[PDB]
Design an enzyme around this catalytic site. Structure first.
Site, mmCIF file in Angstrom:
data_model
loop_
_atom_site.group_PDB
_atom_site.id
_atom_site.type_symbol
_atom_site.label_atom_id
_atom_site.label_comp_id
_atom_site.label_asym_id
_atom_site.label_seq_id
_atom_site.Cartn_x
_atom_site.Cartn_y
_atom_site.Cartn_z
ATOM 1 C CE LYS A 1 0.162 -8.127 -14.358
ATOM 2 N NZ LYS A 1 0.681 -8.756 -13.203
ATOM 3 C CG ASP B 1 -4.799 -11.714 -10.557
ATOM 4 O OD1 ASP B 1 -4.385 -11.983 -9.512
ATOM 5 O OD2 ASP B 1 -4.494 -10.900 -11.575
ATOM 6 C CD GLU C 1 -5.563 -10.272 -5.754
ATOM 7 O OE1 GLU C 1 -4.652 -10.901 -5.319
ATOM 8 O OE2 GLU C 1 -5.465 -9.069 -5.536
HETATM 9 O O1 LIG Z 1 -3.764 -14.146 4.551
HETATM 10 C C1 LIG Z 1 -3.906 -13.437 3.070
HETATM 11 C C2 LIG Z 1 -5.082 -13.029 2.825
HETATM 12 C C3 LIG Z 1 -5.139 -12.356 1.512
HETATM 13 C C4 LIG Z 1 -3.967 -12.183 0.762
HETATM 14 N N1 LIG Z 1 -4.000 -11.519 -0.526
HETATM 15 C C5 LIG Z 1 -4.661 -10.317 -0.696
HETATM 16 C C6 LIG Z 1 -4.599 -10.060 -2.004
HETATM 17 N N2 LIG Z 1 -3.566 -10.987 -2.608
HETATM 18 C C7 LIG Z 1 -3.354 -12.107 -1.700
HETATM 19 C C8 LIG Z 1 -2.534 -12.495 1.344
HETATM 20 C C9 LIG Z 1 -2.700 -13.307 2.683
HETATM 21 O O1 LIG Z 2 4.475 -4.914 -2.791
HETATM 22 C C1 LIG Z 2 3.453 -5.960 -2.695
HETATM 23 C C2 LIG Z 2 3.104 -6.805 -1.611
HETATM 24 C C3 LIG Z 2 2.347 -7.894 -1.664
HETATM 25 C C4 LIG Z 2 1.708 -8.067 -3.072
HETATM 26 N N1 LIG Z 2 0.765 -8.942 -3.161
HETATM 27 C C5 LIG Z 2 0.823 -10.249 -2.787
HETATM 28 C C6 LIG Z 2 0.042 -11.178 -2.866
HETATM 29 N N2 LIG Z 2 -0.876 -10.285 -3.663
HETATM 30 C C7 LIG Z 2 -0.449 -8.946 -3.718
HETATM 31 C C8 LIG Z 2 1.919 -7.321 -3.958
HETATM 32 C C9 LIG Z 2 2.947 -6.364 -4.191
HETATM 33 MN MN LIG Z 3 -3.030 -9.429 -11.455
HETATM 34 MN MN LIG Z 4 -2.911 -10.860 -4.406
HETATM 35 MN MN LIG Z 5 -2.327 -11.954 -8.457
#
Ligand SMILES: Oc1ccc(-n2ccnc2)cc1
Ligand SMILES: Oc1ccc(-n2ccnc2)cc1
Ligand SMILES: [Mn+2]
Ligand SMILES: [Mn+2]
Ligand SMILES: [Mn+2]
Ligand SMILES: [Mn+2]
EC number: 3.1.-.-
Length: 201
Positions: free
Chosen positions: A139, A113, A85
């Site tokens: 989930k 995650d 994540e």
């Molecule tokens: O460039 C990014 C960095 C973090 C990102 N992210 C935050 C939570 N999940 C994915 C997505 C894209």
């Molecule tokens: O509405 C969203 C947008 C991005 C999201 N996301 C991408 C990666 N991590 C969380 C989740 C839900």
């Molecule tokens: Mn999650």
């Molecule tokens: Mn995410």
């Molecule tokens: Mn996730």
């Protein structure tokens, strides 16, 4: 009381690193944090819980899992969790595919995650404003990897996890639940909570 903005709430109660990562996540999937503001706060919350879940957990010199809450872990300690994540999609899958080719652990359909090097499994962390059993089933039906461990937290302190296996000690999970309680209370003081809760849908 006065109605606050969710933007102000997020900037004031989350670390700027977390806020920046959440903005990036939303951008990556074509959503605007200034319009989808409840989703924004939910992403910040989820990021924070994932970081809190991995914090302080190490594997020691003997290969056993330990907790070190001091700032300086011994240099021979290994972090217990890989954090998936908080990474852009290319880097996240780069980390996953790696672990999968390395450990032999099968590949997930959806990005998990965390990876737990003690329990040798991926973890999907859920944070819900609804009932944990409902959210758990949603989930489980979605990923159906069945090697990926699911751990759901609610804002009122309930938890549900795969096979009633909660991975962490009570104190670690209590830190997370205390933080969620704080988020809810602070949102409520700004008259943001009811709408945030009802928006999960
Ligand atoms: O460039 C990014 C960095 C973090 C990102 N992210 C935050 C939570 N999940 C994915 C997505 C894209
Ligand atoms: O509405 C969203 C947008 C991005 C999201 N996301 C991408 C990666 N991590 C969380 C989740 C839900
Ligand atoms: Mn999650
Ligand atoms: Mn995410
Ligand atoms: Mn996730
Ligand atoms: Mn370190």
């Amino acid at each position: 009381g006065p109605l606050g903005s969710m933007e102000d709430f997020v900037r004031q109660c989350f670390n700027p690193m977390i806020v920046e990562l959440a903005e990036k996540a939303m951008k990556e999937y074509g959503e605007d944090p200034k319009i989808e503001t409840n989703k924004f706060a939910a992403i910040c919350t989820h990021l924070e819980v994932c970081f809190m879940y991995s914090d302080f957990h190490f594997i020691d010199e003997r290969g056993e899992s330990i907790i070190v809450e001091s700032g300086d872990p011994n240099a021979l300690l290994k972090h217990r969790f890989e954090i998936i994540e908080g990474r852009d999609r290319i880097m996240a899958w780069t980390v996953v595919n790696s672990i999968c080719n390395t450990t032999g652990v099968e590949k997930p359909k959806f990005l998990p995650d965390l990876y737990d090097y003690k329990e040798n499994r991926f973890i999907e962390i859920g944070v819900t404003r609804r009932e944990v059993h409902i959210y758990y089933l949603e989930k489980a039906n979605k990923i159906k990897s069945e090697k990926t461990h699911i751990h759901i937290f609610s804002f009122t302190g309930e938890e549900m996890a795969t096979k009633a296996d909660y991975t962490l000690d009570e104190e670690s999970r209590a830190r997370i639940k205390t933080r969620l309680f704080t988020i809810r209370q602070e949102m409520a003081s700004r008259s943001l909570w009811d709408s945030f809760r009802q928006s999960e849908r």
